[PDB]
């Protein structure tokens, strides 16, 4: 219903120019802590109104699509889209740092955790009695304004004693220990396989179409939920010119209630929990146990993307319960009142690296995100 | 007085600015005088009444002068005893009726004088200084142990003639000495006679300030400042020093520069006289003035009424200004008007006036044998007053209340 937005002068690069096609994150002088000037982004968009953003690049060879999605930084790092407007980071240590008059925020790094084993460490610089941080894991659903842990879209641990955070509650289930100005936390997140994920997601799609559906029309929400595939993508990602640059708006997931399903076996409303998950933390190398084992399964039938419920029902038509390759848990970080935390990406900057062959570095799946982004859109280019 | 302890704070401002009350008294009134506590308001009237109001509902509790000793002529002045129980009232009927509220309508005792009267001023509840018309001495009316003989000692040394100094017309007893009484002649000299409460009277001060007909002399309640109201359009506040041996000096002068008008009555604040309040005389004088007695300047103007005002009373316990109408007879009243607060609704409410930047703490995302006494009443209030010396409440006329339902 809308035409493809045409290119502009800076969009057609040439061999010689060394400028970077997603226009650089313009930084702003935030404050001085840890003997370092950190910086908030000033002129690059943030994720709002239940959107996620990504700088597009005009890709000249492509015909139906005229653009490609792109990230800014070379290796894996924080995507500056799902963060807060007072959340500062410097080009020196990549530690996120809010000012002392700013509160509990959240910052997500762009690497998705979908299946397999991913491990990385997170450096912690300045955690005083007055400045705090909450490191851990979250989906794309967890609002980066609130700190991770109020909901079932993220989990983390406290700074002092590492009280494990879910539903806002503080749980002393691990070994209690406090952060200081020099620790580093490592994350053995064991995930189920995408085959095992797909069947438990398909099971709920069958267990939700009619099994509790005996609202004024229940066929079309069943029809949308027929039409509920495990790994298939429905993406509406469109190029836009914002602030004199070029970007994508991607449809984002909404908050919803707890996935409950009546198993006739044990006679109790059972919770959907992922298979064989483990949330192990390193405290300077030592292991501390499994914080959570029952991670949510999310892939079609637990994440509702943004949907026009009065436009589509009346009628060609998209679906709520889809994938968009951004679906899963992320490297999630928070900061409070000057509490600084830095994310470590590569094996060369890791000190306590366990010896598993299934472990791949944080930069690795980032490249697999680089691998997935173009070729899924090449498939959508036909 | 426990309203003001939690009213809350923000009521000490040392004047009232809004007129809140109006005693719609049909029979016009000259002098008004509050009770020593904030309870009652005596209203000296023109046709010989002395109406006495209860200040809480703006409606009278009695009008004395029914049984014995009604002021037949107009009443010029009324003072009260130190407690608030008796009441000396000097009128133009040549009598000086001392009342007792215990037996309300019946006068306690009176005395026939040499002429009409200007004022009265009560030093101890019995003794009272009364100004006889055009007499160079004031006849102090000491109510002795016997009720028939009031020794009217001349308030004058035996041979010091004040012909050329004037004629005594005002006398205000000193509060913190109580034995010196300063009296004002009619040609600018001010005599200061110290009673021994024998009758010896030392002339502690005789001096002309200006060749004017002295209208009124007032003292601060700490005796520190003394102000005079000449017949020239000037108010002369002094600085009073006494141990006896007494001495004043000209602190400041107050005058109507624009309108160049006369001053009717003047009055001082509670503690040390930080404020003077005066009522102008001429046409278009619709408002009392205020003066910062140290800086000397016109601080505020109390724009309430509609036409000239004659007498000023300031009972600091209620922080009120009663001010009688010169023309209508109506009795305007200013009052420190507190506004309510909705923070009284709940014990955790709070009334801010700015969009405050609440700063985030942590847990917004995280889910008796002490000394008890019942015996001592409080000694002071937020104004530093002499509370807990129990004032003489009015005895409601319980001899005549039983008919008082039927036909007054």
From TrEMBL, chain A:
Residues 55-247 form the B30.2/SPRY domain. GO terms for molecular function: transcription cis-regulatory region binding. It comes from the Eukaryota. It is found in: Nucleus. Keywords: Nucleus. Signal peptide: none annotated. PROSITE patterns: B302_SPRY (PS50188). Gene3D superfamilies: 2.60.120.920. CDD domains: SPRY_Ash2 (cd12872). One of its GO terms (cellular component) is Set1C/COMPASS complex. InterPro entries: ASH2, B30.2/SPRY, B30.2/SPRY_sf, ConA-like_dom_sf, SPRY_dom. Belongs to the cclA family. PANTHER family: SET1/ASH2 HISTONE METHYLTRANSFERASE COMPLEX SUBUNIT ASH2, SET1_ASH2 HISTONE METHYLTRANSFERASE COMPLEX SUBUNIT ASH2. This is KLLA0C10945p. The lineage of its organism: Eukaryota, Fungi, Dikarya, Ascomycota, Saccharomycotina.
UniProtKB/TrEMBL annotation, chain B:
Pfam families: WD40 (PF00400). Keywords: Nucleus, Repeat, WD repeat. It is found in: Nucleus. WD repeats lie at residues 68-101. One of its GO terms (cellular component) is Set1C/COMPASS complex. The keyword rRNA-binding does not apply. The keyword Nucleus applies. Coiled coil: none annotated. This is KLLA0A08800p. It comes from Kluyveromyces lactis (strain ATCC 8585 / CBS 2359 / DSM 70799 / NBRC 1267 / NRRL Y-1140 / WM37) (Yeast).
